[PDB]
Amino acid sequence: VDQRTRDALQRSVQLAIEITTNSQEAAAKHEAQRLEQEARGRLERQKILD
Amino acid sequence: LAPRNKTRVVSYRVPHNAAVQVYDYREKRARVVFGPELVSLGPEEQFTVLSLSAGRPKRPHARRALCLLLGPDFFTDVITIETADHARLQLQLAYNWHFEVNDRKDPQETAKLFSVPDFVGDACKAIASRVRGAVASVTFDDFHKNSARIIRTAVFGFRDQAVFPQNGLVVSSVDVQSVEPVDQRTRDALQRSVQLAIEITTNSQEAAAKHEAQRLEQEARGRLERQKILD
Amino acid sequence: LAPRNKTRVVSYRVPHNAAVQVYDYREKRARVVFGPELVSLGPEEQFTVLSLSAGRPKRPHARRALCLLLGPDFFTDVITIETADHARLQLQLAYNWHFEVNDRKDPQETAKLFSVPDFVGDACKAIASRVRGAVASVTFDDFHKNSA
Ligand SMILES: NC(=O)c1ccc[n+]([C@@H]2O[C@H](COP(=O)([O-])OP(=O)(O)OC[C@H]3O[C@@H](n4cnc5c(N)ncnc54)[C@H](O)[C@@H]3O)[C@@H](O)[C@H]2O)c1
Ligand SMILES: NC(=O)c1ccc[n+]([C@@H]2O[C@H](COP(=O)([O-])OP(=O)(O)OC[C@H]3O[C@@H](n4cnc5c(N)ncnc54)[C@H](O)[C@@H]3O)[C@@H](O)[C@H]2O)c1
């Protein structure tokens, strides 16, 4: 019935949206770090062989 | 228009996949006429007028009808629901329906088609209640990525058709068309999310290009050093 | 235009790959006429008028028709869908379709062609619902590289 409860629920849903976006960003960052580490290791081994 | 001749026998042409109900108030006998047949009223018979539901939000008493159409059709309703995260979002569904008349010569089963005064609004409100009940216990993200399965499981059960035994009406399928959040701020947040996803993809491609360039540079440097040693 | 002669037998020329439904309300007998044949109404028969869907977004009740075309055709619709990354993107599809009439002499199977009041809108909305449901669980990049 009250508008203030609706406002609170709107803030809750916006926080949930922010949570989802932050989760996707963290997953992308972790994948990028893994790929960078793999590339660095391969480069170091190739330097040793050279 | 042109006034009818009151002394002429009143007649009506039932369409294909349709039926009418008339009761002979004098001889005390009801009948349901099926198919494309032509129905002529007796001196005391009457037509069972049906007041149904229609409109974008399916308001009641918006379409008076004389014959009941019992062929494969569909009606669409706009359902507003809320998720477990309290995100308000409205739907647009389509309900494929048809009447299952096992025996067209049965005075009891055929009378059941007109038993429900308004099958359209009844079915729409029942399915809307089912969908609203099932969704409210589901978060916004899971519903967004799985709305089809959630809605199909909500409307039906554990089942391919949502049969209504009051009149024989069955809903053989549901087709969700649009799922849009009611509030603009949720749309803005989702736009920011999609822009961040685009940025993620571009950054990934840039990192891959940089790694390949570094590998090629290292290979060239090694070959150059070996050639210098040989020289 | 020029008013028709009401006393003349009403006739219609069904095109190739088309059919009509007429019911003789007096003799109580329906029939579906196929092919390029010419259909003449009896004193009490009527034509089954079909109200179909048409337009760029496929609005309903935009094309009234008298004969049903059952030959290889296609209709196009504009579908707006959303990805798992919440990226809004609209589509333009084309649906190659045709009616499979196993027996043109069967009073039951041939009557099934006119069973659905509007096949165009029904098929368009069903396929749009399928496409929208499948895409929503797919990220934007995977859909972009593999939309087909
Ligand atoms: N197979 C198909 O896809 C198919 C078949 C028939 C009709 N259609 C069309 O799909 C459209 C859906 O539009 P909408 O639902 O947004 O419009 P709407 O909400 O105004 O339609 C109300 C519903 O009531 C039903 N209805 C109307 N008159 C009736 C009668 N005399 N007896 C029994 N039922 C009756 C119709 O089937 C319709 O689905 C309908 O207008 C219909 O013409 C589709
Ligand atoms: N093989 C082919 O590629 C092929 C074959 C026939 C027609 N076409 C043409 O492709 C075009 C596609 O255009 P659109 O879909 O954007 O226009 P649209 O959306 O206005 O077309 C509506 C659809 O309804 C169908 N239709 C029209 N009148 C009909 C009737 N009396 N009975 C049954 N079905 C009927 C048409 O095939 C059309 O695809 C059609 O106009 C058609 O002329 C292509």
PDB file of N, CA and C in Angstrom, chain A:
ATOM      1  N   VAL A   1       0.829  -1.202   0.000  1.00  0.00           N
ATOM      2  CA  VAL A   1       0.000   0.000   0.000  1.00  0.00           C
ATOM      3  C   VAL A   1       0.866   1.255   0.000  1.00  0.00           C
ATOM      4  N   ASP A   2       1.938   1.257   0.787  1.00  0.00           N
ATOM      5  CA  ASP A   2       2.756   2.450   0.943  1.00  0.00           C
ATOM      6  C   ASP A   2       3.792   2.553  -0.169  1.00  0.00           C
ATOM      7  N   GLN A   3       4.114   3.792  -0.545  1.00  0.00           N
ATOM      8  CA  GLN A   3       5.083   4.025  -1.614  1.00  0.00           C
ATOM      9  C   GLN A   3       6.516   3.798  -1.141  1.00  0.00           C
ATOM     10  N   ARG A   4       6.785   4.027   0.146  1.00  0.00           N
ATOM     11  CA  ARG A   4       8.141   3.881   0.667  1.00  0.00           C
ATOM     12  C   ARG A   4       8.623   2.435   0.588  1.00  0.00           C
ATOM     13  N   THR A   5       7.727   1.473   0.831  1.00  0.00           N
ATOM     14  CA  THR A   5       8.087   0.072   0.652  1.00  0.00           C
ATOM     15  C   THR A   5       8.458  -0.217  -0.797  1.00  0.00           C
ATOM     16  N   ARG A   6       7.710   0.359  -1.742  1.00  0.00           N
ATOM     17  CA  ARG A   6       8.030   0.196  -3.155  1.00  0.00           C
ATOM     18  C   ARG A   6       9.402   0.780  -3.472  1.00  0.00           C
ATOM     19  N   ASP A   7       9.715   1.943  -2.894  1.00  0.00           N
ATOM     20  CA  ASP A   7      11.029   2.546  -3.109  1.00  0.00           C
ATOM     21  C   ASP A   7      12.140   1.654  -2.567  1.00  0.00           C
ATOM     22  N   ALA A   8      11.935   1.088  -1.375  1.00  0.00           N
ATOM     23  CA  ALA A   8      12.930   0.187  -0.801  1.00  0.00           C
ATOM     24  C   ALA A   8      13.135  -1.043  -1.677  1.00  0.00           C
ATOM     25  N   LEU A   9      12.046  -1.616  -2.193  1.00  0.00           N
ATOM     26  CA  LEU A   9      12.175  -2.780  -3.065  1.00  0.00           C
ATOM     27  C   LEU A   9      12.854  -2.426  -4.386  1.00  0.00           C
ATOM     28  N   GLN A  10      12.611  -1.220  -4.905  1.00  0.00           N
ATOM     29  CA  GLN A  10      13.320  -0.771  -6.099  1.00  0.00           C
ATOM     30  C   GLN A  10      14.819  -0.665  -5.838  1.00  0.00           C
ATOM     31  N   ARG A  11      15.196  -0.120  -4.680  1.00  0.00           N
ATOM     32  CA  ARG A  11      16.614  -0.063  -4.335  1.00  0.00           C
ATOM     33  C   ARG A  11      17.203  -1.464  -4.208  1.00  0.00           C
ATOM     34  N   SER A  12      16.436  -2.400  -3.645  1.00  0.00           N
ATOM     35  CA  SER A  12      16.907  -3.777  -3.541  1.00  0.00           C
ATOM     36  C   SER A  12      17.152  -4.392  -4.916  1.00  0.00           C
ATOM     37  N   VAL A  13      16.226  -4.184  -5.855  1.00  0.00           N
ATOM     38  CA  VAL A  13      16.395  -4.782  -7.179  1.00  0.00           C
ATOM     39  C   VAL A  13      17.568  -4.135  -7.913  1.00  0.00           C
ATOM     40  N   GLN A  14      17.780  -2.827  -7.715  1.00  0.00           N
ATOM     41  CA  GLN A  14      18.943  -2.193  -8.328  1.00  0.00           C
ATOM     42  C   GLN A  14      20.241  -2.738  -7.740  1.00  0.00           C
ATOM     43  N   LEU A  15      20.261  -3.026  -6.435  1.00  0.00           N
ATOM     44  CA  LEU A  15      21.448  -3.632  -5.842  1.00  0.00           C
ATOM     45  C   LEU A  15      21.679  -5.037  -6.384  1.00  0.00           C
ATOM     46  N   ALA A  16      20.603  -5.787  -6.632  1.00  0.00           N
ATOM     47  CA  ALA A  16      20.754  -7.111  -7.233  1.00  0.00           C
ATOM     48  C   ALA A  16      21.343  -7.019  -8.638  1.00  0.00           C
ATOM     49  N   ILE A  17      20.887  -6.038  -9.423  1.00  0.00           N
ATOM     50  CA  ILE A  17      21.448  -5.828 -10.756  1.00  0.00           C
ATOM     51  C   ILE A  17      22.935  -5.509 -10.663  1.00  0.00           C
ATOM     52  N   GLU A  18      23.303  -4.617  -9.737  1.00  0.00           N
ATOM     53  CA  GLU A  18      24.713  -4.292  -9.544  1.00  0.00           C
ATOM     54  C   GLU A  18      25.517  -5.527  -9.161  1.00  0.00           C
ATOM     55  N   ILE A  19      24.943  -6.392  -8.323  1.00  0.00           N
ATOM     56  CA  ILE A  19      25.626  -7.620  -7.926  1.00  0.00           C
ATOM     57  C   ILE A  19      25.902  -8.492  -9.143  1.00  0.00           C
ATOM     58  N   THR A  20      24.907  -8.641 -10.021  1.00  0.00           N
ATOM     59  CA  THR A  20      25.099  -9.468 -11.211  1.00  0.00           C
ATOM     60  C   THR A  20      26.193  -8.899 -12.113  1.00  0.00           C
ATOM     61  N   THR A  21      26.179  -7.579 -12.328  1.00  0.00           N
ATOM     62  CA  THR A  21      27.209  -6.970 -13.171  1.00  0.00           C
ATOM     63  C   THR A  21      28.598  -7.144 -12.567  1.00  0.00           C
ATOM     64  N   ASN A  22      28.721  -6.957 -11.250  1.00  0.00           N
ATOM     65  CA  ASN A  22      30.016  -7.129 -10.600  1.00  0.00           C
ATOM     66  C   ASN A  22      30.504  -8.567 -10.710  1.00  0.00           C
ATOM     67  N   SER A  23      29.591  -9.534 -10.591  1.00  0.00           N
ATOM     68  CA  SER A  23      29.982 -10.932 -10.742  1.00  0.00           C
ATOM     69  C   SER A  23      30.524 -11.206 -12.139  1.00  0.00           C
ATOM     70  N   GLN A  24      29.843 -10.692 -13.169  1.00  0.00           N
ATOM     71  CA  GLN A  24      30.326 -10.919 -14.530  1.00  0.00           C
ATOM     72  C   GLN A  24      31.687 -10.257 -14.749  1.00  0.00           C
ATOM     73  N   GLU A  25      31.880  -9.056 -14.193  1.00  0.00           N
ATOM     74  CA  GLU A  25      33.165  -8.379 -14.325  1.00  0.00           C
ATOM     75  C   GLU A  25      34.279  -9.172 -13.649  1.00  0.00           C
ATOM     76  N   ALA A  26      34.008  -9.706 -12.458  1.00  0.00           N
ATOM     77  CA  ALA A  26      35.009 -10.498 -11.753  1.00  0.00           C
ATOM     78  C   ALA A  26      35.369 -11.755 -12.535  1.00  0.00           C
ATOM     79  N   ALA A  27      34.368 -12.420 -13.118  1.00  0.00           N
ATOM     80  CA  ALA A  27      34.653 -13.611 -13.914  1.00  0.00           C
ATOM     81  C   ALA A  27      35.529 -13.277 -15.117  1.00  0.00           C
ATOM     82  N   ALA A  28      35.220 -12.171 -15.804  1.00  0.00           N
ATOM     83  CA  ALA A  28      36.043 -11.766 -16.943  1.00  0.00           C
ATOM     84  C   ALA A  28      37.475 -11.473 -16.512  1.00  0.00           C
ATOM     85  N   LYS A  29      37.640 -10.771 -15.386  1.00  0.00           N
ATOM     86  CA  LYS A  29      38.980 -10.456 -14.901  1.00  0.00           C
ATOM     87  C   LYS A  29      39.764 -11.721 -14.572  1.00  0.00           C
ATOM     88  N   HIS A  30      39.113 -12.694 -13.936  1.00  0.00           N
ATOM     89  CA  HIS A  30      39.799 -13.935 -13.590  1.00  0.00           C
ATOM     90  C   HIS A  30      40.237 -14.691 -14.837  1.00  0.00           C
ATOM     91  N   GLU A  31      39.364 -14.763 -15.848  1.00  0.00           N
ATOM     92  CA  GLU A  31      39.744 -15.444 -17.085  1.00  0.00           C
ATOM     93  C   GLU A  31      40.913 -14.742 -17.769  1.00  0.00           C
ATOM     94  N   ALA A  32      40.887 -13.406 -17.791  1.00  0.00           N
ATOM     95  CA  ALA A  32      41.987 -12.659 -18.391  1.00  0.00           C
ATOM     96  C   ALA A  32      43.298 -12.927 -17.665  1.00  0.00           C
ATOM     97  N   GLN A  33      43.262 -12.957 -16.330  1.00  0.00           N
ATOM     98  CA  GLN A  33      44.475 -13.236 -15.567  1.00  0.00           C
ATOM     99  C   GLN A  33      45.010 -14.632 -15.864  1.00  0.00           C
ATOM    100  N   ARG A  34      44.120 -15.623 -15.957  1.00  0.00           N
ATOM    101  CA  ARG A  34      44.565 -16.981 -16.264  1.00  0.00           C
ATOM    102  C   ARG A  34      45.250 -17.041 -17.623  1.00  0.00           C
ATOM    103  N   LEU A  35      44.635 -16.421 -18.635  1.00  0.00           N
ATOM    104  CA  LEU A  35      45.226 -16.448 -19.971  1.00  0.00           C
ATOM    105  C   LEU A  35      46.569 -15.729 -19.991  1.00  0.00           C
ATOM    106  N   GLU A  36      46.667 -14.599 -19.282  1.00  0.00           N
ATOM    107  CA  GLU A  36      47.929 -13.871 -19.222  1.00  0.00           C
ATOM    108  C   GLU A  36      49.023 -14.717 -18.585  1.00  0.00           C
ATOM    109  N   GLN A  37      48.699 -15.424 -17.499  1.00  0.00           N
ATOM    110  CA  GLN A  37      49.695 -16.274 -16.851  1.00  0.00           C
ATOM    111  C   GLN A  37      50.152 -17.393 -17.780  1.00  0.00           C
ATOM    112  N   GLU A  38      49.213 -18.014 -18.499  1.00  0.00           N
ATOM    113  CA  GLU A  38      49.591 -19.077 -19.430  1.00  0.00           C
ATOM    114  C   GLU A  38      50.522 -18.551 -20.519  1.00  0.00           C
ATOM    115  N   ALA A  39      50.188 -17.388 -21.089  1.00  0.00           N
ATOM    116  CA  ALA A  39      51.034 -16.804 -22.125  1.00  0.00           C
ATOM    117  C   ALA A  39      52.420 -16.479 -21.584  1.00  0.00           C
ATOM    118  N   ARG A  40      52.489 -15.930 -20.369  1.00  0.00           N
ATOM    119  CA  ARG A  40      53.779 -15.600 -19.775  1.00  0.00           C
ATOM    120  C   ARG A  40      54.633 -16.849 -19.586  1.00  0.00           C
ATOM    121  N   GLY A  41      54.027 -17.935 -19.102  1.00  0.00           N
ATOM    122  CA  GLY A  41      54.785 -19.165 -18.925  1.00  0.00           C
ATOM    123  C   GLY A  41      55.325 -19.711 -20.234  1.00  0.00           C
ATOM    124  N   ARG A  42      54.483 -19.729 -21.272  1.00  0.00           N
ATOM    125  CA  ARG A  42      54.952 -20.200 -22.573  1.00  0.00           C
ATOM    126  C   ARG A  42      56.084 -19.324 -23.102  1.00  0.00           C
ATOM    127  N   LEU A  43      55.968 -18.007 -22.931  1.00  0.00           N
ATOM    128  CA  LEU A  43      57.013 -17.101 -23.399  1.00  0.00           C
ATOM    129  C   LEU A  43      58.330 -17.352 -22.675  1.00  0.00           C
ATOM    130  N   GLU A  44      58.279 -17.563 -21.357  1.00  0.00           N
ATOM    131  CA  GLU A  44      59.509 -17.832 -20.616  1.00  0.00           C
ATOM    132  C   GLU A  44      60.160 -19.133 -21.071  1.00  0.00           C
ATOM    133  N   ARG A  45      59.356 -20.180 -21.291  1.00  0.00           N
ATOM    134  CA  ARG A  45      59.938 -21.435 -21.764  1.00  0.00           C
ATOM    135  C   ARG A  45      60.577 -21.264 -23.139  1.00  0.00           C
ATOM    136  N   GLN A  46      59.917 -20.519 -24.032  1.00  0.00           N
ATOM    137  CA  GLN A  46      60.483 -20.296 -25.358  1.00  0.00           C
ATOM    138  C   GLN A  46      61.781 -19.502 -25.276  1.00  0.00           C
ATOM    139  N   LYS A  47      61.841 -18.516 -24.377  1.00  0.00           N
ATOM    140  CA  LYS A  47      63.082 -17.773 -24.178  1.00  0.00           C
ATOM    141  C   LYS A  47      64.201 -18.692 -23.711  1.00  0.00           C
ATOM    142  N   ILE A  48      63.887 -19.620 -22.802  1.00  0.00           N
ATOM    143  CA  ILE A  48      64.899 -20.563 -22.331  1.00  0.00           C
ATOM    144  C   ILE A  48      65.412 -21.417 -23.486  1.00  0.00           C
ATOM    145  N   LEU A  49      64.502 -21.900 -24.334  1.00  0.00           N
ATOM    146  CA  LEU A  49      64.924 -22.722 -25.470  1.00  0.00           C
ATOM    147  C   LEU A  49      65.790 -21.926 -26.447  1.00  0.00           C
ATOM    148  N   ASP A  50      65.421 -20.667 -26.699  1.00  0.00           N
ATOM    149  CA  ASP A  50      66.219 -19.830 -27.589  1.00  0.00           C
ATOM    150  C   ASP A  50      67.615 -19.599 -27.025  1.00  0.00           C
TER     151      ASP A  50
END
